[PDB]
Design a binder for this molecule. Structure first.
Ligand SMILES: CCC(=O)Nc1ccc(C)cc1O
Ligand SMILES: [Cl-]
Ligand SMILES: [Cl-]
Length: 182
């Protein structure tokens, strides 16, 4: 059945266990977070600078911007992995906001296990420029984590945190957690 209990460890932050993983949500500025991986939600050319991608590319810096466009011209990518630049992370994984969100999160989880990473921070992927519906996005993100746990794949990954720009989108994620709790 996988799901633990929803609680609030700090004001406006909510968490629950999904198997061995602690899943958390909060509102705020993702560029101020520390994690092994931070996720960007961008366009198919990996050069968008609007919404979360503006915040991430401006903070990360020009060397990360250049790395993205260099990889984009090399081959056709569903996502790319760069350094962290001046963000507080080891790598940034840049996913395409218009793509299937469950598929994108599954890829992020698998890449983090390959690097023996423990912590991930992501935005509400697809809800900005791509204009996917928040309720479908929340369902997809949490389903990806459930499938990863069900397959026995969680080994190094211990914490997955969604830091969300709009409080109204945070409310959608909280309701989805309550629906699933043990
Ligand atoms: C993926 C959803 C998204 O873009 N969210 C977002 C994050 C930060 C800022 C400043 C604006 C935003 O709209
Ligand atoms: Cl988006
Ligand atoms: Cl967001």
């Amino acid at each position: 059945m996988f799901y633990g209990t929803v609680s609030s460890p700090d004001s406006g932050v909510y968490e629950m266990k999904i198997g061995s993983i602690i899943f958390q949500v909060a509102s705020g500025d993702i560029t101020k977070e520390e994690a092994d991986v931070i996720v960007n939600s961008t366009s198919n050319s990996f050069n968008l600078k609007a919404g979360v991608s503006k915040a991430i590319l401006e903070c990360a810096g020009q060397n990360v911007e250049r790395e993205c466009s260099q990889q984009a011209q090399q081959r056709k990518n569903d996502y790319i992995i760069t350094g962290g630049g001046f963000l507080r992370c080891k790598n940034i994984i840049h996913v395409i906001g218009g793509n299937d969100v469950k598929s994108s999160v599954s890829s992020v989880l698998q890449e983090c296990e390959k690097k023996n990473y423990s912590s991930i921070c992501l935005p509400a992927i697809g809800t900005g420029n791509a204009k996917q519906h928040p309720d479908k996005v929340a369902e997809a993100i949490i389903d990806a984590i459930e499938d990863f746990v069900q397959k026995g794949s969680a080994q190094s990954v211990k914490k997955v945190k969604v830091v969300i720009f709009l409080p109204q989108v945070l409310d959608v994620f909280y309701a989805n957690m309550k629906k699933r709790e043990g």
